[PDB]
Design a protein around this nucleic acid. Structure first.
Ligand SMILES: Nc1nc(=O)n([C@H]2CS[C@H](COP(=O)(O)OP(=O)(O)OP(=O)(O)O)O2)cc1F
Ligand SMILES: [Mg+2]
Ligand SMILES: [Mg+2]
Lengths: 358, 983, 363
DNA sequence: AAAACGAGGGCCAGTGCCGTAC
DNA sequence: AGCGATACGGCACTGGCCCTCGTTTT
């Protein structure tokens, strides 16, 4: 709709005129991403790795090759995780059921002639005994659904579906309502040892791991989520005469922006540079609109910063050079407030840490 | 042509003054000495139209010049002396700008205090400087008090604007400002920073005190000890340079009180305003005391320094000026970055060595370490007290699944944790340093509650005394030590006993690993104590040392580090590289404060010469500014310049970090600096003081002939002639010579020449004994040389002859001693007496060397003054724009412009010539040699430096950064006459 | 050339015996271990910090791995060059400005027929022709500076000034491996040739405001192999004469180190208020510091064993939880740099770790 | 329960060696 | 009478005054 157009003028996506359709975006075919989309994706992936690093006991990060080891590119992100299985058996001391997570750029063919598309996906391969396989599969279902629910503006948009077949005993798929058509966001399968037993026969005496004085070849859980589709999901979840993207604070790429109000004076630039440094010193993404060069209107400025999903906008006028007072302006409430420049860092940090809840 | 050297002069027709017996004695002296192999190489004689002389001699020329240059200022000072003081106001006005206090101390809002002259002392809150905050100034009419904009509470942004105090009056005579350390006040003047100007000059009471009744640093050290038989008679006639002391000296009034809180340097701006009235009052006391002191000093200085040359010379010497730009800030940033990097590397390596050496604590294996056993090796674990009870021991009191139903067991463990936390806090008290680590490691760590805490062991050094022993092997030996001096180094049989006993309890001393390390070293108390290297057992004593001081630590022994002995391990070339790192940051370590804090005021595009804006340089949103060097006009000895930063400013070495500091003074576009270095002054001065005492001509001495014989251009000076003996070129030979003239001590010349040439002691000693000929000879029981023809006699009464003393042969030290015996002023020529504390009247005086040095260095400083007044005289008389001066004792550089640079250099040559002729005339004759009459080098370029071709370290590429090139001079500048119409 | 066993034993690398210097330098290695990819993660993040975040006018770019028209990309410079106009629109034509990206690249290699992939962090700096060599010198000094820190011996990393076949100036960054120097990062000054070739029609949309005039941007480029860098730091971390006593430990810089602290259980056995260890665990990971869990264990062995096991993993500190700490509240601590026992409080330990990393990042 | 004495660390100035210039 | 001289600073080290806290006291 009118969301794809404000992602072009605000650089969430790369420049296109024909391959800007919903179908081409759902496709791996690109026109990749604009800086905003890149940062959104990076924060999203950071939170993903965070939502799986807090998980007890231990999951080891790995990286797989992209091409065929014997001469070709990868479709799934499972094989590479399976190759490092026997090795990472040593590090866990073969003690308990354990997993391997990884985030990578996987490919898939897109259909004149036919081309190839890219999607950046995050996968987790969870090795667990057959008896406690299904239960852990449901566990991961819950934790993943909750994961998509945390940053969501609406939990009803995210859905979870059950299924099965002859190859997979029980599987679950995570869908996302658009609502121009509910789409696939993540797949959770319960593959047997066949996949693993196919690339190590044999003497298969290496594969079975200890399970309380018990030797047993572990059932394999295949977690596979898409972060591009997820990015688009949250983008459509944030779209709200007003045209403002209300992405989640922890997820939002740039979370604050500051300009000047008084005419182009070196001192204003000095103060703004100071605040720039102070804010970047405590890990806060800030957009420098004080460069500037003109600082035209304030309304189209706020419109620009709202279409960029900036949490707070800051204005450094000439009065700031006296009292230290500065013009704050929210996004979710758009309330024009004012406060001292020294207590800005603390307020922002506290606001970000307050959004930490599940 | 003629008389072995003279030029075409119009400085007096007569003249000889032949002295035939005298020149016969001189020629006879120079034949037996003996030098009679003349090279006969006539320098190209110069014919030019000299500027108007005012007659009769050049003495009265310079006198009239110096008087007319200092007449308005003298009048102003006289207006300060006969001034009737209006009393201090009852209360100070708390208003921005100036406030005039006239009748009954009322408040008259004024922008500029229009007075012919006034005393001054500015105040500055150091807490957020270097911006002026308070000021008080009294005038022959009334009082004035200036306040800065720091009256309103704001969040300012200091980029050093034109906020400094305004003092100069506008045109569309005239000014004089006196004060204690007047240059610091001058640096806070709004209109002193402008490229042009200025009519206003300054008078320093401190410099004046130094000129009148000053004292040496050595005299200062024992003056303050007042809290060598007749060395205490000058204790009450002079004083240290403090304001309270100099007031208690010249006024002798009640002891003025000093601020007990030091609020301007200890406190903030907040606690200043709370005590505004009082601080103002303090400033008033200061300017009042300064006024009294000045009033008492001016006539004294005028008496002791009668020649106006010194007056005007001291006037222009105070108004120095250093133009700069953004490249300064770039210089600061880059140099500081380089410094922090090298220090990061060094400290990283050292703390790495310190970390891996901390592992041999367990168990007691440190006693075997030949380097690490003197120190602590402590093991603490304190402390706790009992509060729980009673009578029970608190020291001893594989299943697979997948559960998650206990979703809130996490916050349970969390609650358990936090509840467990806030119940131990009352068990200890004050967090001490890490006890688990040995003491030597605790000391080598920053405190935990320190705002600048860095991880692991910081504070590593270089130049400490723990770390050099921590690693370094020691001169073909193993251990190094310290007690009264560190490892012995640089700056008929003898035997010494040994011993070894035990008694308990001291620290264990190993001495086997030493022997084995010696074995490992030679794998590739006696003997081996002379030239080789070894360490005994215990004792401890010298047993084969040459230095009488020691050296902690070896930080300038690179050739004795990159030749084998000595080295370090582990290991390899880490030693020489560490020493390199030290040498690189040696300058910036002891200067970074003075350089980075060195303020500078930027002037906007409104208050600058538009004739520069027209020049094809803006430059690209570039800022242009400047800084006044802030120099004490006269400091001992003799009345030279004294400045914390720019006088101790390192030269251009490709090794040092902040070595570009000298070349950062970049002249504004359209402008260029033209300067010169006297080569040489002190040597030729000593020479003249020799030949003018011996005879009438200039070459009638053994020493005074070799001086004015060599040319530095494609030739060999006297310094260069002693440097090629060999010999070491060239600064070293200079140090050897100037060291010889002021006390050529046999062991000093020994260890020095041996330090500079790097050979063996015997041949060196031979060379020294060969060169000690110059000072030889000299004079019941006594030295076997007197006025009688033989010393041996029987009961011969002659106590009336033991009053004469003087060396013989080559040198002329006898005259330098002659000026050092007179109990009366001793002022040649001109011509100013100094210090009631060094005058042999009522002083032992036992300060001979300081007085000889005073003689010749004063000749150098009077030389400086003469150069100044001369340069100023033909800079205003003619159309030479840019009169701003920048001098360093010998060298002197003027800030001119690109179109008047050659005529300015010409003015320099003129100046030098006239000054040389002055020194010649003050002793006779007016005739002067050739290869000494004119400057050999005259630098003309954008930034100031040593040579015309400059390289650097930190910016790596000099011309890579926006620079130009220099030009040597020369003989080609002798084609542009002082008249405006040239080329 | 024997620390390989330490790379296999503790997975910073693959456990395959076929890991020759060629196989690693080419990018044909089977893959890095978890500790290895975490090490490379922190190294790359430390690139991202001291290149993109701190310096303005620098924005992240997402270049694809292939071409819409088989072989892949050999460098991620081009894909960045493609995004020039839009990233000119977001900066309002205010050059100099740069685009950085850390992407894996594929190099064709003829083994004396295969293809080796290696992760590279490239930054393309669009700068006016008036200030090309100055920015080249700047980035040379700052890249070299960024690589010379973290090092236990910065003397190894060197730089080489070299010129193009045409005349374009460029600089190469070397690390001194035990078998000689090796290229790890390449800096070049491309004279706006490629951009001109990419936009033949309208050269107007390429003009960037130098200040008072719009000029054609000269293209600077710095490509840093983070794999070879990771290996370089891995070698630098490991220790060398008359030391009298040797211990196996790799001293990685505390910032890029894979596992920060290691939490264990001592004395031993003690049940069952050991749930506090879980508390310290989640508290630690909440503040983003890597903590190894020493709970389920088969050893039950000498402390020197797991101490050496943690020093082979370059773990900074070893925190020990015993029952006496369950009593009062002073856990044990053993630093890697200096092996020494030290008692400390809990929240004091958390904040000590945070301050340790934060201050290590500084001077 | 309550008064007193000794151990620990910071702020202070003095002192010894070294860094530069001219 | 015997002699390096004029300065400007820095950092490393130290013995002593002073405040705080604990070990020891009605
Ligand atoms: N050791 C020294 N003592 C000094 O008193 N001086 C100075 C005080 S002023 C005058 C200037 O000496 P310079 O350093 O410029 O050396 P110079 O001009 O006498 O000799 P040269 O021309 O520089 O070769 O003699 C120099 C020394 F090197
Ligand atoms: Mg000279
Ligand atoms: Mg000189």
């Amino acid at each position: 709709l009118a969301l794809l157009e404000i992602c072009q003028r605000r650089h969430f996506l790369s420049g296109s005129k024909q391959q800007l359709s919903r179908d081409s975006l759902l496709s791996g075919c690109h026109p990749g991403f604009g800086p905003l989309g890149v940062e959104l994706r990076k924060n999203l992936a950071a939170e993903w790795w965070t939502s799986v690093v807090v998980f007890r006991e231990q999951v080891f990060p790995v990286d797989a090759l992209h091409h065929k080891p014997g001469p070709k590119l990868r479709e799934n992100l499972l094989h590479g995780a399976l190759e490092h299985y026997v090795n990472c058996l040593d590090l866990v001391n073969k003690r308990l059921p354990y997993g391997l997570a990884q985030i990578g750029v996987c490919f898939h063919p897109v259909f004149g002639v036919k081309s190839i598309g890219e999607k950046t996906e995050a996968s987790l391969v969870w090795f667990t005994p057959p008896r406690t396989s299904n239960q852990w599969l449901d566990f991961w279902l819950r934790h993943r659904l909750q994961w998509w629910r945390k940053f969501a503006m609406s939990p009803s948009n995210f859905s979870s579906s059950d299924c099965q077949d002859e190859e997979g005993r029980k599987g679950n798929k995570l869908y996302y309502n658009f609502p121009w058509g509910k789409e696939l966001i993540e797949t959770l399968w319960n593959l047997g040892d066949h996949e693993l037993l196919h690339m190590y026969p044999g003497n298969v005496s290496k594969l079975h791991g200890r399970d309380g004085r018990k030797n047993v070849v572990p059932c394999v859980l295949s977690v596979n989520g898409d972060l591009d589709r997820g990015m688009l999901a949250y983008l459509y979840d944030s779209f709200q005469h007003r045209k403002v993207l209300k992405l989640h604070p922890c997820l939002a790429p740039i979370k604050v922006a500051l300009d000047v109000g008084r005419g182009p004076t070196l001192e204003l630039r000095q103060v703004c540079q100071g605040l720039f440094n102070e804010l970047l010193e405590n890990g806060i993404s800030v957009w420098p609109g004080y460069l500037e060069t003109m600082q035209s209107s304030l309304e189209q400025l706020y419109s620009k910063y709202d279409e960029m999903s900036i949490l707070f906008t800051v204005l450094v006028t000439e009065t700031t050079l006296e009292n230290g007072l500065i013009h704050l302006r929210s996004r979710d409430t758009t309330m024009k407030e004012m406060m001292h420049i020294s207590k800005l860092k603390d307020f922002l940090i506290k606001y970000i840490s307050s959004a930490k809840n599940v | 042509m003629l008389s072995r050297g003279l030029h075409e002069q119009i400085f007096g027709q007569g003249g000889e003054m032949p002295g035939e017996a005298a020149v016969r004695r001189s020629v006879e002296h120079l034949q037996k000495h003996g030098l009679w192999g003349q090279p006969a190489v006539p320098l190209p004689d110069v014919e030019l139209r000299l500027p108007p002389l005012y007659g009769d001699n050049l003495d009265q020329h310079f006198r009239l010049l110096a008087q007319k240059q200092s007449l308005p200022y003298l009048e102003a000072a006289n207006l300060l002396l006969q001034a009737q003081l209006p009393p201090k106001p009852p209360a100070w006005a708390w208003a921005e700008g100036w406030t005039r206090y006239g009748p009954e101390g009322e408040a008259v809002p004024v922008a500029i205090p229009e007075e012919r002259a006034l005393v001054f002392d500015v105040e500055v809150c150091l807490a957020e400087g270097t911006c002026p905050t308070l000021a008080v100034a009294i005038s022959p009419s009334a009082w004035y008090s200036w306040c800065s904009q720091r009256l309103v509470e704001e969040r300012y942004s200091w980029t050093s604007q034109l906020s400094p105090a305004d003092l100069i009056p506008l045109e569309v005579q005239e000014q004089l400002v006196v004060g204690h350390n007047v240059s610091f006040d001058r640096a806070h003047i709004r209109e002193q920073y402008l490229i042009q100007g200025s009519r206003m000059r300054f008078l320093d009471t401190m410099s004046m005190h130094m000129a009148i009744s000053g004292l040496s640093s050595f005299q200062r050290s024992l003056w303050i000890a007042a809290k060598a038989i007749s060395s205490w008679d000058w204790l009450d006639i002079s004083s240290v340079n403090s304001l309270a002391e100099v007031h208690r000296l010249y006024v002798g009034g009640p002891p003025l009180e000093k601020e007990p809180r030091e609020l301007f340097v200890k406190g903030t701006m907040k606690d200043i305003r709370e005590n505004f009235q009082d601080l103002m009052q303090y400033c008033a006391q200061d300017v009042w005391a300064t006024h009294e002191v000045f009033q008492q000093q001016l006539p004294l200085f005028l008496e002791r320094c009668p020649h106006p040359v010194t007056l005007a010379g001291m006037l222009e010497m105070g108004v120095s000026y250093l133009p700069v730009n953004q490249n300064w800030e770039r210089y600061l940033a880059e140099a500081q970055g380089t410094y922090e990097e090298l220090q990061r590397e060094m400290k990283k390596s050292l703390m790495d060595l310190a970390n891996d050496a901390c592992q041999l604590l367990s168990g007691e294996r440190y006693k075997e370490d030949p380097w690490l056993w003197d120190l602590e090796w402590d093991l603490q674990e304190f402390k706790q007290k009992k509060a729980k009870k009673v009578k029970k021991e608190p020291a001893t009191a594989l299943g697979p699944c997948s559960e998650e139903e206990e979703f809130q067991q996490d916050v349970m463990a969390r609650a358990c944790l936090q509840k467990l936390k806030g119940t131990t806090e009352l068990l200890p008290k004050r967090p001490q340093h890490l006890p688990g680590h040995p003491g030597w490691y605790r000391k080598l760590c920053p405190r935990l509650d320190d705002p600048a805490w860095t991880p692991g062991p910081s504070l590593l050094s270089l130049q400490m005394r723990v770390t050099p022993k921590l690693m370094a092997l020691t001169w073909d030996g193993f251990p190094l030590h310290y007690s009264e001096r560190h490892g012995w180094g640089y700056l008929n049989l003898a035997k010494l006993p040994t011993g070894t006993t035990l008694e308990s309890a001291g620290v264990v001393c190993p001495y086997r690993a030493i022997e084995s390390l010696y074995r490992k070293h030679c794998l590739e108390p006696y003997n081996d104590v002379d030239i080789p290297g070894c360490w005994f057992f215990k004792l401890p004593h010298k047993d084969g040392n040459s230095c009488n001081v020691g050296s902690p630590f070896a930080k300038d022994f690179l050739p004795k580090m990159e030749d084998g002995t000595l080295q370090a391990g582990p290991g390899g070339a880490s030693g020489p590289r560490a020493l390199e790192i030290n040498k690189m940051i040696s300058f910036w370590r002891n200067a970074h404060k003075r350089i980075s804090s060195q303020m500078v005021v930027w002037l906007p595009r409104s208050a600058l010469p538009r004739a520069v804006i027209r020049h094809p340089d803006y430059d690209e949103e570039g800022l242009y500014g400047a800084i006044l060097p802030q120099v004490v006009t006269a400091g001992t000895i003799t009345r030279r310049a004294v400045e914390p930063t720019w006088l101790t400013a390192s030269n251009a070495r490709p090794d040092r970090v902040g070595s570009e500091l000298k070349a950062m003074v970049q002249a504004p576009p359209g402008y260029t600096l033209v300067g010169a270095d006297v080569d040489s002054q002190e040597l030729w001065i000593a020479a003249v003081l020799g030949d003018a005492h011996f005879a009438g001509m200039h070459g009638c001495t053994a020493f005074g002939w070799m001086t004015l014989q060599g040319r530095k251009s494609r030739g060999t000076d006297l310094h260069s002639k002693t440097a090629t003996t060999v010999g070491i070129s060239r600064e070293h030979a200079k140090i050897f010579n100037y060291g010889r003239i002021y006390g050529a001590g046999q062991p000093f010349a020994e260890r020095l020449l041996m330090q500079f040439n790097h050979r063996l002691t015997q041949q060196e000693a031979a060379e020294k004994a060969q060169q000690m000929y110059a000072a030889t000879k000299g004079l019941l029981r006594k030295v076997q040389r007197e006025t009688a023809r033989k010393s041996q006699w029987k009961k011969w009464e002659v106590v009336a002859e033991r009053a004469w003393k003087g060396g013989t042969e080559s040198e002329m030290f006898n005259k330098l001693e002659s000026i050092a015996t007179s109990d009366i002023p001793r002022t040649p020529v001109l011509g100013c007496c100094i210090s009631r504390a060094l005058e042999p009247s009522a002083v032992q005086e036992e300060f001979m060397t300081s007085r000889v040095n005073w003689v010749v260095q004063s000749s150098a400083v009077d030389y400086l003054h003469l150069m100044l007044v001369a340069m100023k005289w033909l800079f205003e008389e003619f159309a030479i724009d840019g009169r701003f001066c920048i001098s360093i004792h010998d060298e002197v550089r003027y800030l001119v412009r690109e179109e008047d640079r050659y005529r300015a250099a010409l003015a320099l040559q003129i100046t030098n010539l006239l000054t040389r002729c002055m020194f010649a005339y003050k002793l006779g004759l007016n005739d002067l040699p050739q290869s000494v009459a004119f400057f050999s080098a005259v630098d003309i370029d954008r930034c100031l430096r040593k040579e015309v071709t400059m390289d650097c370290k930190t910016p790596s590429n000099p011309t890579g950064m926006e620079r130009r090139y220099g030009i040597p001079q020369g003989e080609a500048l002798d084609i542009y006459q002082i008249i405006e119409l040239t080329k």
